[PDB]
């Protein structure tokens, strides 16, 4: 807990810890543990926030979202996940949390663990809060998170700008009436549907019936407010703005950034932004608009105007009067203008394109189903009953092709990755690429052009090497792979483990769009504790015993 974090000095936290401290290598010892219990239940004919009854949902503790985890920088968070679903297994992934030397607690089923069996199966996740900011959690059992197994994480720590009130979490998500397994099945042979609605902090109004409620945020006149915006969607990529107000970015994902004032912000699936809103305008109700750019290349909604109300305290009630001007089209791309407070520097002149640093993404339509996404010639398909960690604990190096293992043996060195977005394919779509266990550096991408143009770019050293940035580029866990283009990333090999690198669009990862970075295998085995190993084997023995009794088959990648 803090000793010097005041509304005038958010930069200070405690003795020897501040905004300037390198959080990746230095963590405060608090000795405090914040514990929670996640009871997953399967509810049929559930009444949703917009009035429409959902066929089936999978909730945590009976609510639309799980409890918002709150702890301080340096604490340990512990969660006992109890699976009371009927047929489905589960695994909770702590998106944003690096799991430094705790790979076995990542929640990546078929990689770091076997799924927790239903009908009462349990497992206790435990991890250290070595990072401060806004993150989230979700299931990784195929597209199970689309049914409601989602929630937020707020690890308190210092900030890059002073503020008065911390308004907390603001998760924006797409909402479908059809269940996730039905949607994965539809997307296997058809183009993805637009969302039925878009929920903002758990609620939205039905554009047809008028039922529901708009999310209502009360701003205090003349005060600076911190808002933690999240995109917890399965496909929808958002654009956000507040009429007559600007937003000052103080963090991108779980990485603190220097103040950057904007009119609107693009949020890819899995992306987060901590912003400061100054209630500097006239007392009235203002609309917080959720819009779409990229000409529907990265999503859409059947609700033409998803919005929230930002009410000034003292002002009258009702709905806002000003509709405002439409925001600029972000073209399905996140901003590369954000510069981290704690800097990093890497050489970019030395990069050479080789098969071992290149990851070509492609859409294979030559099989059954039609929509099969491949990375380097293979669609990922993990084995829930024999995860990558089982191979490590037995000394087996015969990993099947389908696991998409990319073994990185480099010890604490910066590794380079060029991701290619099907430049020779019939068409290309933008993809929100996410990396487990690390924060990557966004070194550069193909020139920003309209997301629906179909303009293709292949990495040319003669012009693209000068377009790269190695002098403190954006550091985060999720960024956009441009349509028909390319993306150059770099991460330091400081965390031995099996880490997934995938597109966060549920339908795509289901279709196989992922690779598994097996980082320093030899170091990983030696760093696995007897408690972690014993428990992993307990859960795998229980899952392998349950599987033959399951009346349903695995229809996708399992991720
Ligand atoms: C996890 O639990 C869910 C919910 O029970 C399971 O989803 C259900 O899966 C079945 C079989 O895939 C679906 O029925 C099938 O639907 C297809 C498409 O319409 C149809 O062609 C088949 O004849 C069959 O009727 C069912 O609709 C679906 N339910 C929901 C709400 O999505 C899922 O299979 C379980 N996952 C695992 C691996 O255990
Ligand atoms: C931000 O969100 C608000 C609230 O959802 C948007 O306000 C809505 O604006 C639309 C027009 O763009 C209004 O609907 C339209 O009404 C006309 C009436 O003649 C009709 O012909 C159209 O077919 C359409 O239905 C709507 O009444 C209004 N919502 C309310 C209740 O105030 C606003 O446009 C959004 N602003 C931006 C820049 O995204
Ligand atoms: C993508 O697959 C290709 C082919 O399977 C890999 O290319 C081979 O890489 C090894 C290791 O460097 C070389 O010894 C071979 O000569 C390469 N074969 C080719 C295509 O000439 C490539 O490494 C894979 N990419 C990644 C990053 O996994
Ligand atoms: C938080 C606040 O400003 N209080 C208002 C109150 O004055 C008003 O009577 C009511 C209905 O509009 O909405 C609330
Ligand atoms: C989970 O919740 C259900 C319904 O609320 C209840 O029946 C069950 O006992 C709970 N399981 C545990 C162990 O909390
Ligand atoms: C989000 O909704 C919750 C309702 O559970 C509310 O307590 C919270 O204040 C809302 N967030 C803000 C500050 O808008
Ligand atoms: C929003 O909440 C505030 C605080 O209670 C209130 O003043 C206002 O009337 C509410 N607006 C709506 C549309 O409910
Ligand atoms: C290694 O793992 C494979 C699974 O891909 C299994 O078929 C094989 O029997 C194992 N061999 C060893 C080393 O025991
Ligand atoms: Cl992560
Ligand atoms: Cu995630
Ligand atoms: Cu993740
Ligand atoms: Cu994708
Ligand atoms: Cu993942």
Swiss-Prot record:
Enzyme Commission no: 1.10.3.2
Cysteines joined through disulfide linkages: 4-12, 114-540, 298-332
Cofactor(s) it depends on: Cu cation
User: Sorted alphabetically, which CDD domains does this protein's record hold?
Assistant: CuRO_1_MaLCC_like, CuRO_2_MaLCC_like, CuRO_3_MaLCC_like
Record keyword Methyltransferase present:
no
Show the GO MF annotations: copper ion binding; hydroquinone:oxygen oxidoreductase activity
Question: Which of UniProt's keywords are assigned here?
Answer: Copper, Disulfide bond, Glycoprotein, Lignin degradation, Metal-binding, Oxidoreductase, Signal
**Where is Cu cation 1 bound in this sequence?**
93, 434
Q: What is the purpose of this protein?
A: Lignin degradation and detoxification of lignin-derived products.
Q: What is this protein called?
A: Laccase-1
What species is given as this protein's source?
Answer: Melanocarpus albomyces
* Primary gene name: LAC1
């Amino acid at each position: 807990e803090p000793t010097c974090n005041t509304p005038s000095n958010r930069a200070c936290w405690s003795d020897g810890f501040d905004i300037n401290t390198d959080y990746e290598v230095s963590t405060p010892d608090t000795g405090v543990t914040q514990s929670y219990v996640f009871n997953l239940t399967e509810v049929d004919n559930w009444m949703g926030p917009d009035g429409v009854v959902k066929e089936k949902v999978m909730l945590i503790n009976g609510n639309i979202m799980g409890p918002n985890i709150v702890a301080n920088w340096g604490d340990t968070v512990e969660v006992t996940v109890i699976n009371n679903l009927v047929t489905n297994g589960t695994s909770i992934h702590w998106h944003g949390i690096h799991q430094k030397d705790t790979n076995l607690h990542d929640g990546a089923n078929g990689v770091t663990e076997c799924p927790i069996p239903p009908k009462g199966g349990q497992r206790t996740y435990r991890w250290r809060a070595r990072q401060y900011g806004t993150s989230w959690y979700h299931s990784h059992f195929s597209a199970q998170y689309g049914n409601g197994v989602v929630g937020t994480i707020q690890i308190n720590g210092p900030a890059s700008l002073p503020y008065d009130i911390d308004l907390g979490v603001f998760p924006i998500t797409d909402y479908y009436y059809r269940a996730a397994d039905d949607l994965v099945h539809f997307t296997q042979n058809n183009a993805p549907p637009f969302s039925d609605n878009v929920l903002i902090n758990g609620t939205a109004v039905n554009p047809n019936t008028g039922e529901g409620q708009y999310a209502n945020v009360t701003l205090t006149p003349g005060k600076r407010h911190r808002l933690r915006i999240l995109n917890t969607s399965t496909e929808n990529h958002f654009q956000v703005s507040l009429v007559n107000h600007t937003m000052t970015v103080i963090a991108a994902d779980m990485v603190p950034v220097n103040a950057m004032t904007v009119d609107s912000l693009f949020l890819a699936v899995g992306q987060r932004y901590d912003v400061v809103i100054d209630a500097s305008r006239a007392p009235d109700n203002y609309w917080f608009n959720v819009t779409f750019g990229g000409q529907a290349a990265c999503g859409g909604s059947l609700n033409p105007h998803p919005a929230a109300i930002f009410h000034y305290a003292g002002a009258p009630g009702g709905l806002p009067t000003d509709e405002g001007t439409p925001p600029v089209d972000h073209q399905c791309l996140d901003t590369l203008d954000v510069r981290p407070v704690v800097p990093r520097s890497v050489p970019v002149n030395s990069f050479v394109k080789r098969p071992d640093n290149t990851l070509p993404v492609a859409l294979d339509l030559t099989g059954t189903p039609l929509f099969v996404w491949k990375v380097n010639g293979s669609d990922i398909n993990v084995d829930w009953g024999k995860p990558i960690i089982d191979y490590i604990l037995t000394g087996n190096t015969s990993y099947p092709v389908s696991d998409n293992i990319v073994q990185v043996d480099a010890v604490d060195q910066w590794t380079y990755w060029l991701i290619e977005n099907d430049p020779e394919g019939p068409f290309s779509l933008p993809h929100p690429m996410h990396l487990h266990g690390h924060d990557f550096l966004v070194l550069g991408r193909s020139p920003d052009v309209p997301a629906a143009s179909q303009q293709r770019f292949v990495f040319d050293p003669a012009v693209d090497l000068a377009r790269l940035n190695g002098d403190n580029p954006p550091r985060r866990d999720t960024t956009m792979l441009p349509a028909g283009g390319w993306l150059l990333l770099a991460f330091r090999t400081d965390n031995p483990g099996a880490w997934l690198f995938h597109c966060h669009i549920a339908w795509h990862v289901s279709g196989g769009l992922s690779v598994d970075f097996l980082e320093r295998p030899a170091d990983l085995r030696q760093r696995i504790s007897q408690e972690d190993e014993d428990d992993f084997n307990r859960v795998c023995d229980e899952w392998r015993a349950y599987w033959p009794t399951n009346p349903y088959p695995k229809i996708d990648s399992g991720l």
